[PDB]
Amino acid sequence: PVMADLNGGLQFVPELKEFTAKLRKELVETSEVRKAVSIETALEHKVV
Amino acid sequence: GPIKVELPTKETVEIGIVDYEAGASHGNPVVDFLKRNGSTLEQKVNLENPIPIAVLDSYTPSTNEPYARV
Protein backbone atom coordinates (compact mmCIF):
# COMPACT_ATOMS: atom_id res chain seq x y z
CA PRO A 1 0.00 0.00 0.00
CA VAL A 2 1.00 3.53 -0.86
CA MET A 3 0.35 6.46 1.46
CA ALA A 4 0.63 9.79 -0.37
CA ASP A 5 0.55 12.99 1.71
CA LEU A 6 -0.84 15.69 -0.54
CA ASN A 7 -1.46 17.98 2.46
CA GLY A 8 0.74 20.99 1.60
CA GLY A 9 2.44 21.03 5.05
CA LEU A 10 -0.95 21.78 6.70
CA GLN A 11 -0.21 19.22 9.50
CA PHE A 12 2.70 21.42 10.86
CA VAL A 13 0.20 24.31 11.65
CA PRO A 14 -0.54 23.70 15.37
CA GLU A 15 -4.16 24.12 16.64
CA LEU A 16 -5.47 24.45 13.06
CA LYS A 17 -9.18 24.79 13.85
CA GLU A 18 -8.58 27.75 16.26
CA PHE A 19 -6.13 29.24 13.68
CA THR A 20 -8.86 29.06 10.94
CA ALA A 21 -11.63 30.42 13.30
CA LYS A 22 -9.29 33.39 14.21
CA LEU A 23 -8.55 34.17 10.46
CA ARG A 24 -12.35 34.00 9.80
CA LYS A 25 -13.25 36.41 12.70
CA GLU A 26 -10.39 38.87 11.81
CA LEU A 27 -12.01 38.94 8.27
CA VAL A 28 -15.80 38.93 9.14
CA GLU A 29 -15.20 41.52 11.97
CA THR A 30 -13.25 43.80 9.49
CA SER A 31 -16.09 43.36 6.89
CA GLU A 32 -18.98 44.09 9.36
CA VAL A 33 -17.11 47.05 11.03
CA ARG A 34 -16.30 48.65 7.60
CA LYS A 35 -19.98 48.13 6.52
CA ALA A 36 -21.36 49.75 9.75
CA VAL A 37 -18.76 52.65 9.84
CA SER A 38 -19.34 53.44 6.10
CA ILE A 39 -23.20 53.33 6.50
CA GLU A 40 -23.01 55.73 9.54
CA THR A 41 -20.48 58.09 7.81
CA ALA A 42 -22.94 58.27 4.81
CA LEU A 43 -25.94 58.97 7.16
CA GLU A 44 -23.91 61.68 9.06
CA HIS A 45 -22.93 63.33 5.68
CA LYS A 46 -26.64 63.06 4.56
CA VAL A 47 -27.82 64.85 7.82
CA VAL A 48 -25.14 67.64 7.70
CA GLY B 1 -22.58 67.20 27.22
CA PRO B 2 -21.41 64.26 29.35
CA ILE B 3 -21.24 60.57 28.31
CA LYS B 4 -21.91 58.45 31.40
CA VAL B 5 -21.42 54.71 32.01
CA GLU B 6 -23.90 52.79 34.23
CA LEU B 7 -22.02 51.19 37.22
CA PRO B 8 -23.17 47.86 38.79
CA THR B 9 -25.18 49.88 41.45
CA LYS B 10 -27.16 51.50 38.48
CA GLU B 11 -25.42 54.85 39.37
CA THR B 12 -24.13 56.69 36.22
CA VAL B 13 -20.65 58.36 36.21
CA GLU B 14 -18.99 60.54 33.53
CA ILE B 15 -16.46 58.70 31.27
CA GLY B 16 -16.27 61.38 28.50
CA ILE B 17 -18.04 64.13 26.52
CA VAL B 18 -20.01 64.57 23.32
CA ASP B 19 -18.22 67.55 21.62
CA TYR B 20 -19.65 68.29 18.13
CA GLU B 21 -19.07 71.70 16.43
CA ALA B 22 -20.09 72.40 12.77
CA GLY B 23 -20.68 75.50 10.59
CA ALA B 24 -23.40 75.45 7.87
CA SER B 25 -25.55 72.27 8.29
CA HIS B 26 -29.11 70.91 7.71
CA GLY B 27 -29.15 68.87 10.94
CA ASN B 28 -27.49 67.53 14.10
CA PRO B 29 -25.75 64.21 13.23
CA VAL B 30 -25.01 63.46 16.96
CA VAL B 31 -28.74 63.30 17.88
CA ASP B 32 -29.61 61.56 14.56
CA PHE B 33 -27.01 58.84 15.43
CA LEU B 34 -28.26 58.51 19.07
CA LYS B 35 -31.95 58.34 17.92
CA ARG B 36 -31.25 55.54 15.36
CA ASN B 37 -28.77 53.50 17.52
CA GLY B 38 -29.71 54.32 21.17
CA SER B 39 -33.05 54.39 23.04
CA THR B 40 -34.65 57.60 24.49
CA LEU B 41 -34.81 57.57 28.35
CA GLU B 42 -38.28 59.04 29.14
CA GLN B 43 -38.62 60.37 32.77
CA LYS B 44 -42.47 60.46 32.31
CA VAL B 45 -44.23 57.05 32.50
CA ASN B 46 -47.93 56.82 31.56
CA LEU B 47 -50.34 54.89 33.80
CA GLU B 48 -52.20 51.94 32.19
CA ASN B 49 -55.33 54.22 32.14
CA PRO B 50 -55.74 57.93 33.09
CA ILE B 51 -57.51 58.39 36.49
CA PRO B 52 -60.14 61.20 36.34
CA ILE B 53 -59.61 63.58 39.33
CA ALA B 54 -62.28 66.33 38.74
CA VAL B 55 -64.28 68.39 36.21
CA LEU B 56 -64.31 71.90 37.77
CA ASP B 57 -66.17 75.12 36.77
CA SER B 58 -64.36 78.48 37.19
CA TYR B 59 -65.05 82.08 36.02
CA THR B 60 -62.79 84.83 34.63
CA PRO B 61 -63.36 88.09 36.54
CA SER B 62 -65.56 90.94 35.11
CA THR B 63 -62.44 93.22 35.20
CA ASN B 64 -58.71 92.50 34.56
CA GLU B 65 -57.52 95.50 36.68
CA PRO B 66 -57.16 93.52 39.98
CA TYR B 67 -54.88 90.88 38.30
CA ALA B 68 -53.10 93.71 36.39
CA ARG B 69 -52.38 95.47 39.73
CA VAL B 70 -50.96 92.47 41.71
From Swiss-Prot, chain A:
Tell me, in a sentence or two, what this protein's role is: Fatty acid synthetase catalyzes the formation of long-chain fatty acids from acetyl-CoA, malonyl-CoA and NADPH. The alpha subunit contains domains for: acyl carrier protein, 3-oxoacyl-[acyl-carrier-protein] reductase, and 3-oxoacyl-[acyl-carrier-protein] synthase. This subunit coordinates the binding of the six beta subunits to the enzyme complex.
Further details from the record = Present with 17000 molecules/cell in log phase SD medium.
Subunit structure as annotated in this protein's UniProt entry: [Alpha(6)beta(6)] hexamers of two multifunctional subunits (alpha and beta).
Per the UniProt entry, the signal peptide is none
Q: Note the SS bond partners.
A: none
Q: How is it modified after translation?
A: 4'-phosphopantetheine is transferred from CoA to a specific serine of the Acyl carrier domain by the C-terminal PPT domain. This modification is essential for activity because fatty acids are bound in thioester linkage to the sulfhydryl of the prosthetic group.
Q: Write down which residues bear the modification named Phosphoserine.
A: S38
Segments traversing the membrane: none
In its UniProt entry, the species of origin is given as: Saccharomyces cerevisiae (strain ATCC 204508 / S288c)
Specify the protein name.
Fatty acid synthase subunit alpha
Which lineage? Eukaryota, Fungi, Dikarya, Ascomycota, Saccharomycotina
Superkingdom of the source species: Eukaryota
Tell me the protein family, please.
Answer: Belongs to the thiolase-like superfamily. Fungal fatty acid synthetase subunit alpha family.
Swiss-Prot record, chain B:
What domain of life?
Eukaryota
Q: What else is known?
A: Present with 91800 molecules/cell in log phase SD medium.
Into which family does the record put it?
Answer: Belongs to the fungal fatty acid synthetase subunit beta family.
Oligomer status and interactors? [Alpha(6)beta(6)] hexamers of two multifunctional subunits (alpha and beta).
Role description: Fatty acid synthetase catalyzes the formation of long-chain fatty acids from acetyl-CoA, malonyl-CoA and NADPH. The beta subunit contains domains for: [acyl-carrier-protein] acetyltransferase and malonyltransferase, S-acyl fatty acid synthase thioesterase, enoyl-[acyl-carrier-protein] reductase, and 3-hydroxypalmitoyl-[acyl-carrier-protein] dehydratase.
Q: Identify this protein by name.
A: Fatty acid synthase subunit beta
Q: Which organism is it from?
A: Saccharomyces cerevisiae (strain ATCC 204508 / S288c)
Lineage of the native species? Eukaryota, Fungi, Dikarya, Ascomycota, Saccharomycotina
